[PDB]
Amino acid sequence: MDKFRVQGPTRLQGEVTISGAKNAALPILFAALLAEEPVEIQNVPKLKDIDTTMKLLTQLGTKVERXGSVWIDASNVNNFSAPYDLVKTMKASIWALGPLVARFGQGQVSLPGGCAIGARPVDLHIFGLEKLGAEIKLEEGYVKASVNGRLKGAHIVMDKVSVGATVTIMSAATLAEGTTIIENAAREPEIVDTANFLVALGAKISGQGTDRITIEGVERLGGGVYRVLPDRIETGTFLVAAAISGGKIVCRNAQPDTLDAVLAKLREAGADIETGEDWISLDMHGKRPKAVTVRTAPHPAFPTDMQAQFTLLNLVAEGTGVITETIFENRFMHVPELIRMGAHAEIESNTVICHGVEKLSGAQVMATDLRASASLVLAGCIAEGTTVVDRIYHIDRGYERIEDKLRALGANIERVKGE
């Protein structure tokens, strides 16, 4: 089982090129199921999920290939079924649903173990599709979707903000007859990205980024070239990497505007931040971060995906800072790990009271959450001694060559195979 053996402390500084957001690449990849013409999705990170999606797309009759881009030709999609073996490791698979039913009047996606599709009293995906006119069936380990003719625009009010379902409904509504208005729409930069992708295909979408998305269905989507937006969480991870190490870092291929809350938080922590059109610079001026108050909340508020990183920040910051989760109330597995590294924290309800210490200590740590895991690698970078982060395949899944990235930042990191 791969592990990251990090030797600290090392100042993390220099430059990093931010990869495209898997979180945007994914829905865009599925959205490409709508395209009748070739589509080139640029800036797609090389991550397992992308491969799994490619494999899934191909299974559907999609002609797929990749490098920095993923080339998609969904012109001939003929199979409307995402099979078990193809979706088993990837929840994102539900994304094949809306496009399939929207474009082909039918679609189905396997529901492997752990798959909570349809488990909610109101499954947003199902709900939105249903609102669009699709008949949703939960049968034979499958979520099945069918619509006689085309989907119909609908005024859809999402009972909860759902990135996943927002993508599904927005995507599907692009081919629906009429106007679809999604209320309480997820505001994630990834939603905006997917919508913009769609628009590039000829879809009519407005409001992306706001709580209200309005899609004017079109008969067909063509193709085009679309560049996946920068990974805001990777960016944030890198910014934090410098913030917690007295470093100066320039994030290339970044999109500052997806990170308002995070950058503001960083300034609070004492970071000297500058931003350009495609870059973010973070300079600690060799300074230890100042403890900050963090409260995760739906985008554009502080992202829970940055939560562990900021916990780490607080953990080596000056002063006591509180990390509060309003999204994943128990998303604190990194804490006991960090405590083994000398961090001082109390997990109280949905919060972590962080007592910043000057220096962490290497330890053998493991967090299954990718952010927590990356946070641990970061901690190892700044910790005294050797830190072994176990199960880093988690990181591998959500970060494109974080090892290479960190190394280029000055980290003493080594991928250790097995033991």
Short mmCIF file of C-alpha atoms in Angstrom, two decimals:
data_model
loop_
_atom_site.label_atom_id
_atom_site.label_comp_id
_atom_site.label_asym_id
_atom_site.label_seq_id
_atom_site.Cartn_x
_atom_site.Cartn_y
_atom_site.Cartn_z
CA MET A 1 0.00 0.00 0.00
CA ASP A 2 1.64 3.25 -1.10
CA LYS A 3 2.87 5.62 1.56
CA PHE A 4 4.46 9.05 1.50
CA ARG A 5 7.59 9.29 3.58
CA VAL A 6 8.17 12.97 4.23
CA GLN A 7 11.28 14.43 5.86
CA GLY A 8 10.75 17.77 7.58
CA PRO A 9 10.92 20.52 8.18
CA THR A 10 11.06 22.03 4.73
CA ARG A 11 9.87 25.43 3.69
CA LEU A 12 7.38 24.98 0.84
CA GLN A 13 8.07 27.62 -1.73
CA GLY A 14 8.34 28.23 -5.39
CA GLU A 15 5.78 27.58 -8.02
CA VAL A 16 3.14 25.05 -8.65
CA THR A 17 0.94 24.63 -11.61
CA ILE A 18 -2.62 23.93 -10.57
CA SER A 19 -4.30 21.01 -12.31
CA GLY A 20 -7.78 21.11 -13.71
CA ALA A 21 -10.42 20.34 -11.12
CA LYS A 22 -11.45 16.73 -11.22
CA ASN A 23 -14.64 18.07 -9.64
CA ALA A 24 -15.35 20.01 -12.81
CA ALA A 25 -13.73 17.57 -15.25
CA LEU A 26 -16.06 14.82 -14.08
CA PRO A 27 -19.45 16.49 -14.64
CA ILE A 28 -18.09 18.01 -17.79
CA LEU A 29 -17.06 14.53 -18.96
CA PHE A 30 -20.53 13.26 -18.33
CA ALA A 31 -22.00 16.41 -19.78
CA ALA A 32 -20.12 15.52 -22.96
CA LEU A 33 -22.66 12.71 -23.29
CA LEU A 34 -24.89 15.50 -24.61
CA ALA A 35 -22.52 16.54 -27.37
CA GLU A 36 -23.30 15.32 -30.86
CA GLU A 37 -20.01 16.59 -32.12
CA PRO A 38 -16.44 16.06 -30.97
CA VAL A 39 -15.48 17.68 -27.76
CA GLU A 40 -12.07 18.43 -26.44
CA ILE A 41 -11.95 18.82 -22.69
CA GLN A 42 -8.71 20.51 -21.85
CA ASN A 43 -6.80 20.69 -18.64
CA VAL A 44 -8.19 17.43 -17.33
CA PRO A 45 -6.09 16.04 -14.51
CA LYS A 46 -4.70 12.53 -14.83
CA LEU A 47 -6.68 10.92 -12.05
CA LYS A 48 -8.29 7.54 -11.57
CA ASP A 49 -11.78 9.01 -11.76
CA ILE A 50 -11.06 10.45 -15.17
CA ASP A 51 -9.95 7.03 -16.43
CA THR A 52 -12.92 5.32 -14.89
CA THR A 53 -15.14 7.89 -16.54
CA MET A 54 -13.42 7.40 -19.87
CA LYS A 55 -13.95 3.67 -19.53
CA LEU A 56 -17.58 4.29 -18.65
CA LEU A 57 -18.04 6.70 -21.58
CA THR A 58 -16.59 4.17 -24.00
CA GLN A 59 -18.97 1.53 -22.64
CA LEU A 60 -21.75 3.90 -23.71
CA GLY A 61 -20.58 4.08 -27.30
CA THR A 62 -18.41 7.10 -26.69
CA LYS A 63 -15.15 7.39 -28.55
CA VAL A 64 -12.72 8.54 -25.88
CA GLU A 65 -9.06 9.31 -25.65
CA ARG A 66 -6.77 11.39 -23.49
CA UNK A 67 -3.21 12.60 -23.16
CA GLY A 68 -3.59 17.09 -21.15
CA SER A 69 -7.01 16.91 -22.75
CA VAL A 70 -9.67 14.25 -22.88
CA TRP A 71 -11.09 13.97 -26.39
CA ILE A 72 -14.70 12.92 -26.50
CA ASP A 73 -16.83 11.92 -29.43
CA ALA A 74 -20.24 11.12 -28.02
CA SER A 75 -21.84 11.29 -31.48
CA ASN A 76 -22.44 7.54 -31.52
CA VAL A 77 -23.35 6.76 -27.93
CA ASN A 78 -25.50 3.66 -28.28
CA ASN A 79 -25.46 1.99 -24.92
CA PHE A 80 -27.51 3.74 -22.26
CA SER A 81 -26.34 1.66 -19.35
CA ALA A 82 -23.49 2.36 -16.92
CA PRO A 83 -22.71 -1.15 -15.67
CA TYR A 84 -21.68 -2.24 -12.19
CA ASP A 85 -18.10 -3.07 -13.05
CA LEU A 86 -17.72 0.37 -14.57
CA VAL A 87 -19.29 2.45 -11.80
CA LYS A 88 -18.33 0.39 -8.76
CA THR A 89 -15.46 2.62 -7.67
CA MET A 90 -17.02 5.90 -8.72
CA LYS A 91 -20.13 7.68 -7.43
CA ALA A 92 -19.71 10.35 -10.11
CA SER A 93 -21.18 7.71 -12.44
CA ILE A 94 -24.65 8.93 -11.56
CA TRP A 95 -23.74 11.76 -13.93
CA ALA A 96 -24.35 9.56 -16.96
CA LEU A 97 -28.01 9.49 -15.99
CA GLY A 98 -29.29 12.96 -16.82
CA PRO A 99 -27.38 13.30 -20.12
CA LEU A 100 -28.49 9.82 -21.19
CA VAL A 101 -32.15 10.37 -20.48
CA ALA A 102 -31.97 13.96 -21.77
CA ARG A 103 -30.35 13.01 -25.04
CA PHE A 104 -31.60 9.46 -25.49
CA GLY A 105 -34.86 9.31 -23.54
CA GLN A 106 -33.33 6.57 -21.43
CA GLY A 107 -30.45 5.82 -19.14
CA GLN A 108 -29.37 3.67 -16.28
CA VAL A 109 -26.59 3.53 -13.79
CA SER A 110 -25.55 0.68 -11.55
CA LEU A 111 -25.87 1.29 -7.81
CA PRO A 112 -22.95 -0.54 -6.11
CA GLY A 113 -22.69 -1.02 -2.36
CA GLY A 114 -22.38 2.18 -0.39
CA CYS A 115 -24.26 3.90 -3.20
CA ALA A 116 -26.85 6.14 -1.54
CA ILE A 117 -28.68 7.09 -4.75
CA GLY A 118 -32.39 6.94 -3.95
CA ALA A 119 -31.66 6.49 -0.22
CA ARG A 120 -32.58 10.06 0.63
CA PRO A 121 -36.26 10.87 1.19
CA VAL A 122 -35.72 13.26 -1.72
CA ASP A 123 -32.88 12.20 -3.96
CA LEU A 124 -32.03 15.37 -5.84
CA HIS A 125 -30.90 13.57 -8.98
CA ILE A 126 -34.06 11.52 -9.15
CA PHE A 127 -36.15 14.52 -8.15
CA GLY A 128 -34.72 16.83 -10.78
CA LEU A 129 -34.97 14.19 -13.49
CA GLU A 130 -38.51 13.44 -12.45
CA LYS A 131 -39.25 17.18 -12.50
CA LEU A 132 -37.92 17.18 -16.04
CA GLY A 133 -40.41 14.50 -17.01
CA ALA A 134 -38.28 11.42 -16.57
CA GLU A 135 -39.66 8.34 -14.87
CA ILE A 136 -37.08 7.10 -12.38
CA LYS A 137 -36.92 3.46 -11.33
CA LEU A 138 -34.77 1.87 -8.62
CA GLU A 139 -34.54 -1.74 -9.78
CA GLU A 140 -32.00 -4.54 -10.11
CA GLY A 141 -29.23 -2.54 -8.45
CA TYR A 142 -29.89 0.20 -10.99
CA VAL A 143 -31.31 3.67 -11.00
CA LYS A 144 -33.23 3.66 -14.28
CA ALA A 145 -34.43 6.73 -16.10
CA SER A 146 -36.82 7.05 -18.97
CA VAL A 147 -38.76 9.77 -20.65
CA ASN A 148 -41.22 9.52 -23.50
CA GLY A 149 -40.01 12.04 -26.02
CA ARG A 150 -38.02 14.94 -24.62
CA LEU A 151 -37.54 16.16 -21.08
CA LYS A 152 -39.61 19.28 -20.30
CA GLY A 153 -38.24 22.43 -18.73
CA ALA A 154 -39.41 22.74 -15.15
CA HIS A 155 -39.15 25.11 -12.24
CA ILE A 156 -37.08 22.91 -9.98
CA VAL A 157 -36.51 23.79 -6.39
CA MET A 158 -33.73 21.80 -4.87
CA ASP A 159 -34.59 21.06 -1.23
CA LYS A 160 -30.90 21.04 -0.40
CA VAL A 161 -28.01 22.54 -2.24
CA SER A 162 -26.54 19.72 -4.27
CA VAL A 163 -23.57 20.02 -6.55
CA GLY A 164 -24.21 16.52 -7.81
CA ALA A 165 -27.87 16.95 -8.52
CA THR A 166 -27.35 20.49 -9.78
CA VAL A 167 -25.06 19.08 -12.44
CA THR A 168 -27.54 16.36 -13.28
CA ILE A 169 -30.49 18.68 -13.62
CA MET A 170 -28.62 21.47 -15.34
CA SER A 171 -27.01 19.04 -17.74
CA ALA A 172 -30.25 17.28 -18.56
CA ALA A 173 -32.25 20.50 -18.86
CA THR A 174 -29.98 21.64 -21.72
CA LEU A 175 -31.84 19.25 -24.01
CA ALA A 176 -35.18 19.57 -22.31
CA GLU A 177 -37.97 21.26 -24.11
CA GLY A 178 -38.42 24.66 -22.55
CA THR A 179 -36.87 26.60 -19.72
CA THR A 180 -35.68 24.96 -16.56
CA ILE A 181 -35.07 27.06 -13.53
CA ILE A 182 -33.09 25.45 -10.78
CA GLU A 183 -33.65 27.11 -7.40
CA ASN A 184 -31.19 26.63 -4.50
CA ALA A 185 -28.70 25.60 -7.19
CA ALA A 186 -25.22 24.62 -6.03
CA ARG A 187 -22.90 27.56 -6.57
CA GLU A 188 -19.60 25.71 -6.78
CA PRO A 189 -17.12 26.98 -9.34
CA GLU A 190 -17.46 23.46 -10.76
CA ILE A 191 -21.12 24.08 -11.47
CA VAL A 192 -20.18 27.29 -13.25
CA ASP A 193 -17.53 25.34 -15.14
CA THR A 194 -19.93 22.64 -16.20
CA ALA A 195 -22.52 25.18 -17.19
CA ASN A 196 -19.92 27.11 -19.19
CA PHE A 197 -18.92 23.83 -20.81
CA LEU A 198 -22.53 23.23 -21.70
CA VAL A 199 -22.85 26.74 -23.07
CA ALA A 200 -19.79 25.99 -25.19
CA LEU A 201 -21.79 23.08 -26.63
CA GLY A 202 -24.58 25.47 -27.55
CA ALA A 203 -26.65 25.14 -24.39
CA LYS A 204 -28.36 28.23 -23.00
CA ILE A 205 -27.57 28.58 -19.32
CA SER A 206 -27.51 31.66 -17.08
CA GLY A 207 -27.21 32.13 -13.36
CA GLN A 208 -24.45 29.55 -12.93
CA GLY A 209 -22.62 30.52 -9.77
CA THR A 210 -25.78 31.90 -8.20
CA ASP A 211 -28.55 30.07 -6.35
CA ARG A 212 -30.61 30.19 -9.50
CA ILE A 213 -29.76 28.49 -12.75
CA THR A 214 -31.94 28.97 -15.76
CA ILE A 215 -31.51 26.65 -18.68
CA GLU A 216 -33.28 27.21 -21.94
CA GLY A 217 -33.28 23.79 -23.55
CA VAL A 218 -31.97 23.39 -27.08
CA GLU A 219 -32.63 20.55 -29.48
CA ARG A 220 -29.02 19.49 -29.63
CA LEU A 221 -25.57 20.18 -28.28
CA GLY A 222 -22.65 20.15 -30.67
CA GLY A 223 -19.04 19.98 -29.67
CA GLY A 224 -16.23 22.34 -28.97
CA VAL A 225 -13.11 22.82 -26.95
CA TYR A 226 -13.43 23.52 -23.28
CA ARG A 227 -10.73 24.10 -20.69
CA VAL A 228 -11.50 22.68 -17.25
CA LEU A 229 -11.14 25.24 -14.54
CA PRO A 230 -8.29 25.13 -12.02
CA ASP A 231 -8.60 22.87 -8.98
CA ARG A 232 -9.43 25.41 -6.28
CA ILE A 233 -8.81 22.89 -3.55
CA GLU A 234 -5.49 21.85 -4.95
CA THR A 235 -4.69 25.54 -5.18
CA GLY A 236 -5.78 26.07 -1.60
CA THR A 237 -3.78 23.05 -0.55
CA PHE A 238 -0.71 24.60 -2.13
CA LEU A 239 -1.36 28.01 -0.68
CA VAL A 240 -1.69 26.44 2.73
CA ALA A 241 1.47 24.49 2.01
CA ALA A 242 3.33 27.80 1.81
CA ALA A 243 1.31 29.52 4.51
CA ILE A 244 2.27 26.86 7.04
CA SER A 245 5.95 26.80 6.10
CA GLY A 246 6.89 30.47 5.97
CA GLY A 247 7.07 30.04 2.24
CA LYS A 248 6.24 32.10 -0.78
CA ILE A 249 4.38 30.28 -3.52
CA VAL A 250 2.93 31.18 -6.84
CA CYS A 251 0.08 29.03 -8.02
CA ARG A 252 0.08 28.95 -11.82
CA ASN A 253 -3.00 28.08 -13.86
CA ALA A 254 -5.07 29.28 -10.96
CA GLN A 255 -8.42 31.02 -10.77
CA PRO A 256 -8.34 33.42 -7.82
CA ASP A 257 -12.09 34.03 -7.93
CA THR A 258 -12.94 30.46 -7.00
CA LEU A 259 -11.01 31.07 -3.80
CA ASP A 260 -12.32 34.26 -2.23
CA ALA A 261 -13.05 32.76 1.16
CA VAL A 262 -9.83 30.78 1.27
CA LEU A 263 -7.64 33.70 0.29
CA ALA A 264 -9.41 35.95 2.77
CA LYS A 265 -8.81 33.32 5.42
CA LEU A 266 -5.17 33.14 4.41
CA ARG A 267 -4.80 36.93 4.73
CA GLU A 268 -6.25 36.51 8.18
CA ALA A 269 -3.61 33.94 8.93
CA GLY A 270 -1.10 36.63 7.96
CA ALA A 271 -0.48 35.61 4.36
CA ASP A 272 0.63 38.27 1.88
CA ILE A 273 -1.56 37.36 -1.03
CA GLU A 274 -1.53 38.68 -4.55
CA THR A 275 -3.58 37.51 -7.49
CA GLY A 276 -3.39 37.81 -11.20
CA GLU A 277 -5.68 36.58 -13.92
CA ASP A 278 -4.29 33.06 -13.65
CA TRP A 279 -2.14 33.04 -10.63
CA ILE A 280 -2.16 33.41 -6.93
CA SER A 281 0.89 34.30 -4.95
CA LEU A 282 1.16 33.60 -1.25
CA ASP A 283 3.95 34.97 0.82
CA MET A 284 4.37 34.25 4.52
CA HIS A 285 7.54 36.32 4.59
CA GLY A 286 8.98 33.57 6.75
CA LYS A 287 6.19 34.21 9.23
CA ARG A 288 4.31 31.64 11.23
CA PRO A 289 0.60 31.79 10.45
CA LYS A 290 -1.80 33.55 12.85
CA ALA A 291 -4.58 31.30 14.12
CA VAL A 292 -7.84 31.92 12.33
CA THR A 293 -11.47 31.08 12.68
CA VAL A 294 -12.72 28.80 9.96
CA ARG A 295 -16.33 27.96 9.29
CA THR A 296 -17.06 25.78 6.33
CA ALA A 297 -20.24 26.54 4.47
CA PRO A 298 -21.57 26.17 0.91
CA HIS A 299 -19.59 27.83 -1.81
CA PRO A 300 -18.65 30.71 -2.12
CA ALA A 301 -18.16 30.46 1.64
CA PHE A 302 -15.24 28.63 3.16
CA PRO A 303 -14.92 25.20 1.48
CA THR A 304 -15.03 22.05 3.58
CA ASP A 305 -12.49 20.65 1.10
CA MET A 306 -10.02 23.13 2.56
CA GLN A 307 -11.00 22.37 6.11
CA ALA A 308 -8.30 19.87 7.03
CA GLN A 309 -5.64 22.05 5.43
CA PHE A 310 -6.75 25.00 7.50
CA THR A 311 -6.90 22.84 10.56
CA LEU A 312 -3.28 22.08 9.87
CA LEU A 313 -2.68 25.81 9.41
CA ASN A 314 -4.24 26.56 12.79
CA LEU A 315 -2.32 23.68 14.31
CA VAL A 316 0.99 25.39 13.60
CA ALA A 317 -0.40 28.91 13.82
CA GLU A 318 0.15 31.40 16.57
CA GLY A 319 -2.75 31.30 18.96
CA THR A 320 -5.87 29.25 19.31
CA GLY A 321 -8.14 29.11 16.32
CA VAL A 322 -11.40 27.31 15.79
CA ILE A 323 -12.24 25.17 12.81
CA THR A 324 -15.97 24.75 12.39
CA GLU A 325 -17.71 22.30 10.08
CA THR A 326 -21.24 23.12 9.04
CA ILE A 327 -20.99 20.68 6.13
CA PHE A 328 -19.18 17.60 7.33
CA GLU A 329 -19.58 17.91 11.03
CA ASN A 330 -17.26 15.02 11.85
CA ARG A 331 -14.78 15.57 9.05
CA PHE A 332 -11.92 15.65 11.55
CA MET A 333 -9.99 12.41 11.03
CA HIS A 334 -6.92 14.50 10.34
CA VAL A 335 -7.02 15.78 13.93
CA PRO A 336 -6.10 12.64 15.89
CA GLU A 337 -3.46 12.17 13.18
CA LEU A 338 -2.12 15.67 13.71
CA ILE A 339 -2.19 15.18 17.46
CA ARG A 340 0.16 12.25 16.99
CA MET A 341 2.35 14.82 15.26
CA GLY A 342 2.36 17.06 18.31
CA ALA A 343 -0.66 19.14 17.32
CA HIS A 344 -2.88 20.40 20.09
CA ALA A 345 -6.55 20.26 19.41
CA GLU A 346 -9.87 19.43 21.00
CA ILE A 347 -12.64 18.20 18.76
CA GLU A 348 -15.84 19.63 20.26
CA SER A 349 -19.03 18.84 18.39
CA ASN A 350 -18.55 20.14 14.85
CA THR A 351 -15.45 22.09 15.76
CA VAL A 352 -11.77 21.71 16.35
CA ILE A 353 -10.28 24.03 18.88
CA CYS A 354 -6.77 24.35 17.59
CA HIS A 355 -3.88 25.28 19.82
CA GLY A 356 -1.14 26.23 17.40
CA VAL A 357 2.28 24.79 18.20
CA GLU A 358 5.51 25.99 16.78
CA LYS A 359 6.58 22.70 15.35
CA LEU A 360 5.06 19.37 14.49
CA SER A 361 6.81 16.05 15.00
CA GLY A 362 7.09 13.34 12.45
CA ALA A 363 4.75 10.45 13.01
CA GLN A 364 3.15 7.62 11.12
CA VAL A 365 -0.21 8.92 10.14
CA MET A 366 -3.09 8.01 7.91
CA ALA A 367 -6.31 9.68 6.93
CA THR A 368 -8.63 8.20 4.33
CA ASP A 369 -10.15 11.56 3.40
CA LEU A 370 -8.00 12.92 0.54
CA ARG A 371 -7.83 16.45 2.00
CA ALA A 372 -6.93 15.15 5.42
CA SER A 373 -4.39 12.89 3.77
CA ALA A 374 -2.83 15.72 1.76
CA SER A 375 -2.93 17.77 4.97
CA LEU A 376 -0.89 15.05 6.65
CA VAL A 377 1.66 15.12 3.86
CA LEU A 378 1.86 18.87 4.29
CA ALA A 379 2.20 18.42 8.04
CA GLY A 380 5.01 16.00 7.36
CA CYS A 381 6.69 18.64 5.20
CA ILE A 382 6.79 21.03 8.10
CA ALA A 383 7.18 18.53 10.91
CA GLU A 384 10.45 17.76 12.60
CA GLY A 385 11.74 14.47 11.31
CA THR A 386 10.05 11.70 9.39
CA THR A 387 6.40 11.48 8.74
CA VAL A 388 4.96 8.47 7.03
CA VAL A 389 1.59 9.06 5.48
CA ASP A 390 -0.13 5.80 4.79
CA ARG A 391 -2.67 5.04 2.12
CA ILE A 392 -1.63 7.96 -0.02
CA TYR A 393 -3.49 6.38 -2.94
CA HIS A 394 -6.29 8.54 -1.54
CA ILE A 395 -4.25 11.58 -2.41
CA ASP A 396 -3.30 10.07 -5.78
CA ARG A 397 -7.00 9.97 -6.60
CA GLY A 398 -7.64 13.66 -6.06
CA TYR A 399 -4.28 15.31 -6.57
CA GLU A 400 -2.30 14.96 -9.74
CA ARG A 401 1.27 14.15 -8.77
CA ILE A 402 1.22 16.00 -5.46
CA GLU A 403 4.59 14.41 -4.70
CA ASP A 404 6.17 16.01 -7.79
CA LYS A 405 4.43 19.25 -6.94
CA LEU A 406 5.59 19.29 -3.34
CA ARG A 407 9.05 18.18 -4.32
CA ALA A 408 9.33 21.10 -6.71
CA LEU A 409 8.29 23.17 -3.70
CA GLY A 410 11.24 21.92 -1.68
CA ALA A 411 9.53 19.03 0.09
CA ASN A 412 11.60 15.98 0.99
CA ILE A 413 9.08 13.43 0.01
CA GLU A 414 9.36 9.87 -1.07
CA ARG A 415 6.75 7.47 -2.41
CA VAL A 416 7.24 4.27 -0.48
CA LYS A 417 5.82 1.06 -1.94
CA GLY A 418 4.18 -1.21 0.60
CA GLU A 419 6.53 -0.74 3.56
#
